[PDB]
């Protein structure tokens, strides 16, 4: 079940972060798109089906290995989303989150040097949340963040998909 009406909660998450459409430089070595992601989130529940949550996300640093051209990409941001869900069971809920993330992206490379930019990306997430106790809930979700960057400012604009496990505490 969802947090009580008009109550607050806080939480944190760890996840498998994977960047997509990572075109950047012509590195001859490996590009490790898979990284450990991390985030913290807080939320307010309006009714059993609707809540609002805010959080910080660390999406991981992607290396572009190579003997000639090489570099790295990094991204993080703050997000705000509406959480919409309904129960599968009395303790297990299914949900989606929709909103946006304000991100800062940095790239490093010998080719282009150090670059960074800020912008806005939409966030689409879906998952399930299980109430272990009235205060503790665990969640499994997949979060998609679209077009994190800009080809003209940092040379790349990858997408990010993050499969994460999370825990939250409810203060109702």
């Amino acid at each position, epitope marked *: 079940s969802a947090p009580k009406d008009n109550t607050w909660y806080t939480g944190a998450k760890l996840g498998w972060s994977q960047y997509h459409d990572t075109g950047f*430089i*012509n590195n001859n070595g490996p590009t490790h798109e898979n990284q450990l992601g991390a985030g913290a989130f807080g939320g307010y529940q309006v009714n059993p089906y609707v809540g609002f949550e805010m959080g910080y996300d660390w999406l991981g640093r992607m290396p572009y290995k190579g003997s*000639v*051209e090489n570099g790295a990409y990094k991204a993080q941001g703050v997000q705000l989303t509406a959480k919409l869900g309904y129960p599968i069971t009395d303790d297990l809920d299914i949900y989606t989150r929709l909103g946006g993330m304000v991100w800062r992206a940095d790239t490093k*490379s*010998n*080719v*282009y*040097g150090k*670059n960074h930019d800020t912008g806005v990306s939409p966030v689409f997430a879906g998952g399930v949340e299980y109430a272990i106790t009235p205060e503790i809930a665990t969640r499994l979700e997949y979060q998609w963040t679209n077009n994190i960057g800009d*080809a*003209h*400012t*940092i*040379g790349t604009r990858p997408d990010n998909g993050m499969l994460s496990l999370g825990v939250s505490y409810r203060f109702a």
Partner: nanobody, 117 residues
Framework: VQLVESGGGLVQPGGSLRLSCVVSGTGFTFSKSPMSWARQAPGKEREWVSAIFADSSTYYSDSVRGRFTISRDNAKNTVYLQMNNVKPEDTAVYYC????????????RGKGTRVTV
């Protein structure tokens, strides 16, 4: 992005010569701009010869390694190609290229400068 090459001329075998490429225009940051030097010899296709990245790392074709030296002066938006111990094979028109963020290729937008050994 505008590129103008200079420094070419007549030189004897074993001689030395320095070419220059001055970058001007808008919409680009020279200090972050990777640059290259290519050449087209008589009756041959254009050959890449050298490149210098934003971190000042340098790269050379085997045909010029140990004889040519690429360098940059970010205060003057200028790239140089110092040519030593020139061979008859070095006779060519030399072009400099500018690579944009988002592209792996260099744009050779200049008129070139001709070296004759």
């Amino acid at each position: 992005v505008q590129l103008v090459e200079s420094g070419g001329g007549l030189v004897q075998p074993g001689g030395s010569l320095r070419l220059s490429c001055v970058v001007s225009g808008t919409g680009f940051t020279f200090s972050k701009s990777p640059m290259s030097w290519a050449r087209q010899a008589p009756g041959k296709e254009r050959e890449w010869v050298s490149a210098i990245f934003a971190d000042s790392s340098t790269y050379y074709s085997d045909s010029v390694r140990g004889r040519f030296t690429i360098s940059r002066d970010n205060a003057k938006n200028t790239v140089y190609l110092q040519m030593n111990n020139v061979k008859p094979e070095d006779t060519a028109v030399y072009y400099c290229g500018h690579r944009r963020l988002g592209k792996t290729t260099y744009d050779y937008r200049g008129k070139g400068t001709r070296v004759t050994v």
